[PDB]
Design a protein around this ligand. Sequence first.
Ligand code: SF4
Ligand code: SF4
Ligand code: FES
Ligand SMILES: [Mg+2]
Ligand SMILES: [Zn+2]
Lengths: 48, 690, 125, 86, 208, 115, 96
Amino acid sequence: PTTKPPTARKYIWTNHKFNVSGTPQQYVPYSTTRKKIQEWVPPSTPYK
Amino acid sequence: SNLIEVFVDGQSVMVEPGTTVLQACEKVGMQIPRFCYHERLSVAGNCRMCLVEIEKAPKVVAACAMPVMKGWNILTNSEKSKKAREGVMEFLLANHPLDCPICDQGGECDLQDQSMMFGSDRSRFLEGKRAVEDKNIGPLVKTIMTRCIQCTRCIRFASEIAGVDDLGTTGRGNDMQVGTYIEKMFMSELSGNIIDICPVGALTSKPYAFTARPWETRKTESIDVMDAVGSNIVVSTRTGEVMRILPRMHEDINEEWISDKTRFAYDGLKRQRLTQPMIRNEKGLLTYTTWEDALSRVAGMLQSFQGNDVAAIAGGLVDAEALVALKDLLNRVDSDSLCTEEVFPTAGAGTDLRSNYLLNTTIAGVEEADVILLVGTNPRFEAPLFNARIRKSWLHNDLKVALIGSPVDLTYRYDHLGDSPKILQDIASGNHPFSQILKEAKKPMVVLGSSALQRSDGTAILAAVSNIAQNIRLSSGVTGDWKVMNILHRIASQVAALDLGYKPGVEAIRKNPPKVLFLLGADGGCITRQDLPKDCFIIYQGHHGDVGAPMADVILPGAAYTEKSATYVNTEGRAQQTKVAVTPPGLAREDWKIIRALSEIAGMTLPYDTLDQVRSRLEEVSPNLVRYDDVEGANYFQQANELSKLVNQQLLADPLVPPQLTIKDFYMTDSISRASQTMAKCVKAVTEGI
Amino acid sequence: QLIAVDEKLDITTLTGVPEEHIKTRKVRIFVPARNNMQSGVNNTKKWKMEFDTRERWENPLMGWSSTADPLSNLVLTFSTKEDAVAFAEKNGWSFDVEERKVPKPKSKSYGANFSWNKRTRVSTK
Amino acid sequence: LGLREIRIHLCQRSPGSQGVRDFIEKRYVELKKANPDLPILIRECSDVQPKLWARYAFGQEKNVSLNNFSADQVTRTLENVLSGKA
Amino acid sequence: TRPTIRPRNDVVHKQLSAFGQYVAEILPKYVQQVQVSCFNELEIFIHPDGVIPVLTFLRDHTNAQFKSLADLTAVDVPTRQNRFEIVYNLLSLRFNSRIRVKTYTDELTPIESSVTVYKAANWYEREIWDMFGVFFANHPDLRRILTDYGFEGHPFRKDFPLSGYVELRYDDEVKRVVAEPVELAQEFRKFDLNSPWEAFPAYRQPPE
Amino acid sequence: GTSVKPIFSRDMNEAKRRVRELYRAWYREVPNTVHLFQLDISVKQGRDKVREMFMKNAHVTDPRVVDLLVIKGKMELEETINVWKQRTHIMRFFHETEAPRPTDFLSKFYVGHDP
Amino acid sequence: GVRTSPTGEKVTHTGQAYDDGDYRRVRFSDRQKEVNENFAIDLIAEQPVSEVGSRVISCDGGGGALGHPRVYINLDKETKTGTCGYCGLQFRQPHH
Ligand code: SF4
Ligand code: SF4
Ligand code: FES
Ligand SMILES: [Mg+2]
Ligand SMILES: [Zn+2]
């Protein structure tokens, strides 16, 4: 990469990170989609 | 008989005169490739994909338009036919955009599939492609017209089926564009069908856009409950979630079309849902609880009261299993106050004779009938597919249509007799020209709308309509087995409830107010707490929080129509069953199971444990409920008319005004469509154009 | 020499299927409806047997769709309705049979597009 | 003892329901006028056999076969059911 | 039809057709059908009773000499009254040829074991019994070969589910591996792939 | 006529005799299985379980199906005697880690949707 | 275009964040929530609209065969720009 430097992009990490498994920086999976079914909200006032 | 003999690849076929080459080919199980031809639309012959060689004929013919001649040998797989198909496919693909990854049609695209089956595998087009601008025609049908292949299917559908002449072609040559030429919305109760007939991704569903691919969807064949037409549908699901609704072909009900409410209101199934049992707090607010506690409270109240003190109201989306379970449970308490929201006249035969509250001609019978009189109805919005069938027979059989009521747009020309109810009597006495028109008809049809029935005099209107039908029956002789008297329903649950013995309307509850009131999906606002004694115990069972849920003491979450296998009877009297597409959300349960569990906790256990046993009980109450495609029935018009002649309730001087006057009133008529954001967008679009 | 039995065929005890997935299941025997998005009819030729749809839920990790019934993806293909009925009967499955739906033959006339006195006349091409 | 509903299940064209059909054609109207507030639900059966159901107070109900009955026998059966018999 | 298309061999096609006619003439008691495919493969469809007499003939006749049993497997076709198709693939080294012998059976009808004809058949028959439930009469030692001990069902049947009915895990309360009804965190996603347009007109069936 | 080929037995009597032979073999084998596999159950528990497994198929009336069931039972016994099965396979008959599934309508209603 | 929730949890570009009462947040204790900081929608929002002097423009995403399938975009409408359905790049004919 000294004679043939990589192409620059603004989204490329400027700081390389190593394998962070076993550390508080480790990756934790989670669902990335929104809630599908919306529940009815009962009225907040007494009905009688 | 009059058949002629043709040959398909040397195989003999007998066809009737007027059969086209394409139809003769499909008589032997050979499907000719097509783009512009549709068997429910007029022949166009413009796509040229159906070109096929006739033996000893130098020039290929368009199989979709060419009548087949006697002795012709159609060569479906000859070199000439295959080369013609390849050339036409090349021409179709020359300007088509490379959109398949981003096009919603991909995977269920007739252009893609017929390119793979009948086209070549590469390109030799070395020019630039044409690109056209997009047309905004509403919030339902997304338009990307660079993909348009100029089939003219949408134009022919809009003109012939929907009766709207707003689509067309502008320009000519390579520059010909399909559209409206002005910024205009194609808002029809049948508009969404142009998505399905469009072979390509030019017209797509806007609510469905980008969400799923065809190969990952599971198909559940079911029935629509948005009206009383009972259109056969397919629910597409993926990974436990409803994706979209598609028509399912049934020649005698809906053909291959559905209304826009059937097609697009499914998103309301994802909002305002009841997922847990609820009970009132010490303060008076609704709070979640377990099934055990809520059912125990309901059972204690049920054991407290008896007879008239207990009543139930059935909503418009209730199935027959839950209806019969609730009727059995309230009969165990010795209560007969089983009511629906939709009023039907109980005078005379009432619900004793089934043909008294049915569309006895049936939807298919409209094709046969020479004349039809509509009273107090706006069939276009109350029963869109029935109106489509009426327009079909108006177009093809020159049917004469007359309307008594408000002069609504029905997408076909009709003779408007007025809106005064007295016209009926004026017709029945013979003092009207239309009386003579009806007398000389060979297959007359009288349709009375159930919406007209909502009015208090409803009984007088029914008596007058029956008297008109009796005059037709006696004066014009007997034609055999042709039914004249018809009732058109708008409520999916009404006919099953009438078959099971429910009392139409809530008049019984107003006569004797109950201490305990069961609301089974009832969201019409017919009975409020101002109509009931104070400290009345109200139980709401359903799937959505509408008008009914807030005023109840206890909420029992039930299953929607896509979440259960359940029986619905349409306007014709035909029983059909849905299937489970997705299970009920949260703690919600099947409705008849809720009632059976309640009966067990209350000590009066019902004799059925499974769905088969509940359907056996249905057979014990009304056997026609287990015959799942039967539409046949006995004609008991004479007895019903004779009994209706008993009392002489007076008509009112109020013009027949249907609840649905324009398109904006059509989109929201039930708890599911009121919760639908797509229907809200449609209402907003038709109210203000912009 | 043959032994001349006289009882209906029943292989439930030999298939290794759990009891619950024999007596509580309902199979549907039907010819699948044409997908309305396409005009091809090649997927409407054979009979299909499928099972009743059971519960699917959300996996707490990843939000994937989880199931517990082993028959959720079982679809069998048959040449006729009678073959499917026989197969369902010998396996002890309760079944619901839906009759085949064929489109009715239709009268197509191109010339009717230009009728002298009928309503079938088209206003555009 | 408290009669609540009557149900008559007859088959449309089976011979065994002929008498029931005769009844519905001839004597149903007078029966309905005599008992205007009593539900008499006329429904159609598949070919098993004609039936008459009577539903009483608190959900108890009885059934009686009408197979091969004449109009007279159906009339007698309905007369006994509507009165203090059996 | 040049570079892209696979070439034909009329000589082998004719030779195989003639030998199939030969076999059918010699054994009319059992041979029900003979076929030669367009890629030059000979199939003989026989009644089950002839499994042993036919195979023996094909092994021992001077003009057949099919000494090698390459493979023996079963195919499940639930629409047929006789569910299971039994397939024998044989190789003759003397004549450098291959042949296929086909027969049928249902769930309750035994098929004669062919270990006395080909010893190689032994394990193959075991596998069939393991995967399809076809019982072979007079097999020297017939038992499961591929499945777990105590496994219930025959996995290769079309109506057997892909993931089966039970799965395994280690349980610490009992300190052992246990079997429990199968539960999947992600359900296998069924795909509907068939195009609704016919692909091969040469295989179109009559529309009944 | 029905023209059906037998497996071992011509009628139900010979099939029942083969069932009795297999039952005797299993009953004799159970104590050896308890000793060899070092099970924590009693011999009575194992024999009760053997009886239960046999009783599971009491309703069968087809002699061919009975013959095939006896064949499968003989295979299982041969697996057990030769210690091809391990302790996990033997204990799989008892389902000691599966929670008791309710049978009455109300408990199934509370817990979920399955009929 | 990252953004934080009332709980302090970063909101992803999919708009997914655990509610205040959601137990599943426990999975991030003593650990972190992986979030990509380069929001594509904002990045494509910063690209300028290209002025071209033709009614139809061609886009393949740059790089020739290293881009996306080449599509043609109509620019007749003066009320809006022409957007590429693959790349998001915008085009228009000179106006004003
Ligand atoms: S319409 Fe069909 S061929 Fe055209 S881009 Fe869409 S999927 Fe591809
Ligand atoms: S939008 Fe579809 S139906 Fe209309 S002309 Fe174009 S391809 Fe044909
Ligand atoms: S299908 Fe006949 S020309 Fe289009
Ligand atoms: Mg389309
Ligand atoms: Zn681009």
